[PDB]
Symmetry: D3
Subunit: 231 residues, 6 copies
């Protein structure tokens, strides 16, 4: 791994994938036991520890398809990671979706060219691993966390003058985020299992917005679901 300063063996078979390396640090220190930091390259922290006896890693991915693609490719190809669960944030694009709602993404649309590069005329629809998604859905029931299950939009441009969020929302899309298409596509291509669990961090229609700090350290429900679903 050009971008991960770890030795083979230091990363668990199951990895949680926030975009924010400081959230990775918060998750690891708040939820895991006997935490070791295996990566500090580019400040993109990665940690390994235990949750109720099961080994779990937590790896920052950065923002956007290209950043997450680097980390996910390295985790799969160099570290033999099997289960990859993004624990991210998203902007709500529908009135019925509220700030702090937890979303389980079945699939994601995108304006990244990554799949057109591979398929040309084909629209490739990425797909969550159903087993992971079902386990998350059951974990949410166990933990009393309401979840919304549906699709999201993986944006390349956070500030997009040509945004089609209005049409995407009319087509049922719940929220905008920046990573899921890459995670789902790369995991499937390599026969690994992926899922994106998202917390709504802001509402694109109303302007309601959580702070940087809130995003870093207060989205506890999605971590509860993620960790309970794998253990």
């Amino acid at each position: 791994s050009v971008h991960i300063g770890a030795e083979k063996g230091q990363i668990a078979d199951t990895v949680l994938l926030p975009g924010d390396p400081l959230r990775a640090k918060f998750i690891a220190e708040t939820y895991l036991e006997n935490v070791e930091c295996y990566n500090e390259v580019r400040g993109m922290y990665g940690f390994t520890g235990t949750y109720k006896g099961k080994k779990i890693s937590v790896q920052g991915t950065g923002m956007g398809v290209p950043s997450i693609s680097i980390y996910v490719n390295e985790l799969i190809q160099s570290y033999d990671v099997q289960n990859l669960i993004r624990v991210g944030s998203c902007g709500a694009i529908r009135k019925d979706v509220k700030v702090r709602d937890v979303i389980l993404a079945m699939t994601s649309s995108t304006d990244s060219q990554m799949n057109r590069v591979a398929f040309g005329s084909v629209d490739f629809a990425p797909c969550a691993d159903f087993e992971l998604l079902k386990n998350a859905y059951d974990a949410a029931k166990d933990k009393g966390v309401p979840v919304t299950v549906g699709s999201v939009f993986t944006a390349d441009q956070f500030y997009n003058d040509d945004s089609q969020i209005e049409k995407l929302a009319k087509y049922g899309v719940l929220g905008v985020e920046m990573e899921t298409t890459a995670l789902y596509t790369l995991a499937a291509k390599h026969g690994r299992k992926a899922l994106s669990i998202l917390t709504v961090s802001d509402h694109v229609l109303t302007g309601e917005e959580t702070t940087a700090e809130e995003r870093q350290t207060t989205f506890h429900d999605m971590i509860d679901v993620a960790l309970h679903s794998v253990s």
Copy 2:
């Protein structure tokens, strides 16, 4: 409704959508009480009857995105249909898919341009309704029906000189059929609930063909599951 010769009231709020109008006839006569044929236009038969007291319709769609789009648009827009369940077949493209398997499609890839026409540079990923999908999954598990949940590819060209099925299968796509992208996209755009349940007609990769018992068992299990997907 240009293509459906029904009076208002004659179509139920839940419709099963086989591609073959003769299969529509067979489903209606085999599974429903007090069957009426509400459409003979173009020989694309549609029927309504009751299943355990509940009105259910069965409408042939024909083959391909443009044909199903006609029928689904008219069902949704002219008949206020709420739940739309495709019951059809696909050609399996992955070695791990057996011809005795029943597939619940979470999403579908396509070479249809219908979504590029709408979205341009955006790859739209159509999404099944999770409520219908989860009800189907539970119903399948309750009747010991081997079920796989994943994605399919909606082809425009049954005979395609430029087929990318090898790459699609590598990316995890289970099978090829000709309708799901349209059903899922149109239902979502109109806020209706859709699901595609697919039996395997043949194995495109291995060349394996079905037996009589497989055809009978998978078809019956598909209809059984479909009739337990709503509510």
Copy 3:
């Protein structure tokens, strides 16, 4: 043929191709002698008989590029069909085009991706067989049927929120239909002769509209031209 239940030999070298299998039945029973039905698979009727001593088949194609592609590929590749004449309907998109006008299509534009799948950056313009088109034009003069010769648009979406019919009409396009691009492309690729003869069934600008029954059984002029042109 997966979709045609006929034995080699049962289909003539010359085939008329309505979209509606019930129109195929009407044509066969109304214009042909010693009619045999060689296909009932999916209710997509195909018939063979004689017109003034010449063997003629009439095969329903269904609606849309994918449906017609299935039938045309099978007719060419499995049944060695040589001359393929679509006898279809279209919606007028120009003021000067009237309901019940007969159109001979020189070529067709499309929003199907079928040719971009094959050619990428190339815009492939399908082309009628000039010999068939000339024979039709001369037949129309013989039978006293006015014809309009020009181009049509092969639509994937009968109900299209993103329709460019206004711009297409400004560019001279006469009408919208759902099959011609596929017929013309597939026939040329296989060295066979194709022509689309269309009757205007409705006017997209005025809203004038023939009934389902009228479409099924009253477009006699186009059949007269078609049959006279091959005999």
Copy 4:
């Protein structure tokens, strides 16, 4: 008219359009009476004279879609030209096309983006005016001129590392030239009448070259036919 230095009135309502302005000069001096040169801008000569009493213009267009688009737009929009007939050459791409053949183009494929710029996801198929084409065909047959009616490919790159001519020829395309898509599209958009008559300059596939008699005979027959295409 930025690129044509003519006074109103100096250009006829019918114009022949060779690519080479020296061929324009040759056509005008060889076939027309009382010739005047109305344009010398950029050395792209245009001439007007009479053929059997009727005013006819001959305007060099240069090579490629952008160059002919300039001249055709100005002829149509500034000079109210009604009938526009390209008289040029193509490279034959099909074995069955001989270098002694004259081609009347029904339509043209292209790798130009001009129509995607206008239409996006739509493949626009440019269409010759059928009246001009049929007049040309009849004129050709009356003078025993071997004529083929079909489609051509309008190339942007005479030297193309990514040429698809093998596939184009398989799809029935007769030859390659550099102007017809633009002429046909622009004439139709403005409700004017166009046709392209093409001689074969060489055989791209077989490498066959023309002889003196072929060059003379095909050129003369092309001009003769062109001068009998209107009315």
Copy 5:
């Protein structure tokens, strides 16, 4: 060279490339000594002479990517040309750009498909040869000619109903011309050095416009810069 009637050796290693063959003639006769005309094919004049002891050719290219591509390919591949300097005109699309300003193009955007034909999903950005551009910039200082250095847009459609010049100007693009993308791409692909020096001939926003004659014979500053930069 199919389009250049010269023998190897008759064209210099350094070639100036106006679009107008009459400007080529003006440049050659006005600035060069011992001028020979080596090409008259299609009236697209090409000349060779000396400027202060250095051999220089001046070759008309015609208008548009396809025309210039023909000439540039032949000059490189058949005549071993090393340095290619376009001396053209452009339309200003920004308020701060004035008529008769001389522009040195670093790069060019385009709506030609030529690079998508080669690269598909990749946006290829053509690039001036920095050595030639620096030499021109220093020559302009020596000769007292103000220059503007930036990017231009290579248009296929001089008359474009779908023009994006407003958005291009907002992105910093200086002017619209018809050749640079082809020159820069072809020179780089073949390891040769290219530069486009442009004079603003008209202002697209204000309507100010130089005459055909002014374009042909009065853009002396760009020739001064071009010639001084290579000698």
Copy 6:
């Protein structure tokens, strides 16, 4: 500024943009006086200090078009930043590029869709500010720093199964990196000045790796040049 936790005033009008926030820290502490950290959000550190009296900021951008787009948009739109200089690495793709070379990017190609989202059929070529580029070039030459001026490729996929680097290198592209298209496009759209200065991290083609002295010397020379690019 969602992603930058700075007060108005804390960011300078000139910002250096390394991808790695730890390199941002290193640059600021090594080269600037009176350094303050103005951002810790997501661990994407940004610092401001003085260089020879002038306020200069150094902001980590992360990897890829979407990540840098976030930071650049916020710097430009919320902090009124005027000069933006990327200081980073690329993988060399041409045999004639040595790992000891420093590259000033005139433009960049990409497989990002960001500009097709904006422009559709237009290929937008991003362009460095020539004033900054020429200042950098002169500064490089004054310190005897081997500099190459040319284009780079902005990749979305560091690990790309469908890489076109062989063809890009043939077209003259020097190296591959992950940010420049976004920096150049966004700066130009907002009328700000940008440049990318790139060291070579490794040779993608030859496999050559850097030595300690090369890494140190190229990094120091890059920062030195950057700090002499404005004014």
